[PDB]
Write an enzyme that holds these catalytic residues in place. Sequence first.
Site, PDB file in Angstrom:
ATOM      1  N   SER A  43     -58.200  76.352 104.517  1.00 22.93           N
ATOM      2  CA  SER A  43     -58.101  77.610 105.261  1.00 22.93           C
ATOM      3  C   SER A  43     -59.415  78.399 105.250  1.00 22.93           C
ATOM      4  CB  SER A  43     -56.945  78.484 104.723  1.00 22.93           C
ATOM      5  OG  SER A  43     -55.655  77.940 105.015  1.00 22.93           O
ATOM      6  N   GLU A 141     -54.325  73.862 112.845  1.00 26.23           N
ATOM      7  CA  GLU A 141     -53.291  73.937 111.816  1.00 26.23           C
ATOM      8  C   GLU A 141     -51.969  73.410 112.390  1.00 26.23           C
ATOM      9  OE1 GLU A 141     -53.709  74.358 108.840  1.00 26.23           O
ATOM     10  OE2 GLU A 141     -55.339  75.889 108.441  1.00 26.23           O
TER      11      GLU A 141
HETATM   12  O1  LIG Z   1     -55.585  80.692 101.530  1.00 24.88           O
HETATM   13  C1  LIG Z   1     -55.035  79.820 100.842  1.00 24.88           C
HETATM   14  O2  LIG Z   1     -55.493  79.379  99.777  1.00 24.88           O
HETATM   15  C2  LIG Z   1     -53.727  79.240 101.347  1.00 24.88           C
HETATM   16  C3  LIG Z   1     -53.806  78.807 102.798  1.00 24.88           C
HETATM   17  C4  LIG Z   1     -52.429  78.623 103.409  1.00 24.88           C
HETATM   18  C5  LIG Z   1     -52.526  78.049 104.817  1.00 24.88           C
HETATM   19  C6  LIG Z   1     -53.322  76.742 104.855  1.00 24.88           C
HETATM   20  N1  LIG Z   1     -52.546  75.628 104.347  1.00 24.88           N
HETATM   21  C7  LIG Z   1     -51.629  75.094 105.151  1.00 24.88           C
HETATM   22  O3  LIG Z   1     -51.467  75.493 106.303  1.00 24.88           O
HETATM   23  C8  LIG Z   1     -50.796  73.967 104.575  1.00 24.88           C
HETATM   24  C9  LIG Z   1     -50.920  73.738 103.110  1.00 24.88           C
HETATM   25  C10 LIG Z   1     -51.184  72.568 102.425  1.00 24.88           C
HETATM   26  C11 LIG Z   1     -51.185  72.762 101.004  1.00 24.88           C
HETATM   27  C12 LIG Z   1     -50.924  74.049 100.668  1.00 24.88           C
HETATM   28  S1  LIG Z   1     -50.678  74.990 102.019  1.00 24.88           S
HETATM   29  B1  LIG Z   1     -54.708  76.948 104.040  1.00 24.88           B
HETATM   30  O4  LIG Z   1     -55.423  75.796 103.881  1.00 24.88           O
HETATM   31  O5  LIG Z   1     -54.546  77.581 102.850  1.00 24.88           O
END
Ligand SMILES: O=C(O)C[C@@H]1CC[C@H](NC(=O)Cc2cccs2)B(O)O1
Length: 266
Positions: A43, A141
């Site tokens: 993210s 996403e």
């Molecule tokens: O900001 C953060 O640390 C959390 C954030 C959530 C949305 C995104 N993750 C996804 O959409 C699926 C995922 C896979 C494994 C965990 S959540 B992102 O990469 O990370």
Amino acid sequence: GDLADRFAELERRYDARLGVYVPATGTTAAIEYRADERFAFCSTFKAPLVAAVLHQNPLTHLDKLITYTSDDIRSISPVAQQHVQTGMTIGQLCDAAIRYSDGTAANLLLADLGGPGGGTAAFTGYLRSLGDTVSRLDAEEPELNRDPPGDERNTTTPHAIALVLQQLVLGNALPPDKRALLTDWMARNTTGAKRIRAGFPADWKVIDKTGTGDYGRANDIAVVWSPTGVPYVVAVMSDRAGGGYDAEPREALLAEAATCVAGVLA
Ligand SMILES: O=C(O)C[C@@H]1CC[C@H](NC(=O)Cc2cccs2)B(O)O1
Ligand code: NA
């Protein structure tokens, strides 16, 4: 040097792969550990994504209302999923993408850049324009999280992403007004209390963008200000790919890595 050995001990203790990049300054050396190794963005890309939107549009664009449906909620979207009926302005989308890692906001902002691959190509090109020849975004996403270790898709390096963030927040990639908005959104991030923030003393300011993925992927990219107002960029990336796609990400690894960094910059 000794700090490399300490990062290595951290990796061994957590059964993880750690990547660290703190750009050199006029008063400090760079901190680099696996900084030219590839790590999934997760993210974290949502922060430079907001910069791309800022870069390409006048600030009035932030008031543009974007509408979408429940079928657009295909990824973790803490804000967007509660505003299907109202829509959200581009500014609200930028807010959500950074402070809540909102995946639908991210996808809509990608769409706002235009062109093939739902704006993923355009995003990568924005990074190319900042001199980053390494990073690549290949999917929206949530499909961007699906790539196994070794696959270069949807990856960056600590070095590459740190220098991107350096230019965006501290440098002149953005005009100071747009820079301030990016900075403020990262400053009020809600997702990062247990990562870089947890490794710096309370009298240091921390702004950041987190990400979490499969294979124990946990990242944080931050800009920190010392008690005297001296800024540094801190990029910390990790995975635990050894444990499989469902390995638990470890926020504490990033906090401890950041503690090691704070020890060097105090
Ligand atoms: O900001 C953060 O640390 C959390 C954030 C959530 C949305 C995104 N993750 C996804 O959409 C699926 C995922 C896979 C494994 C965990 S959540 B992102 O990469 O990370
Ligand atoms: Na709703």
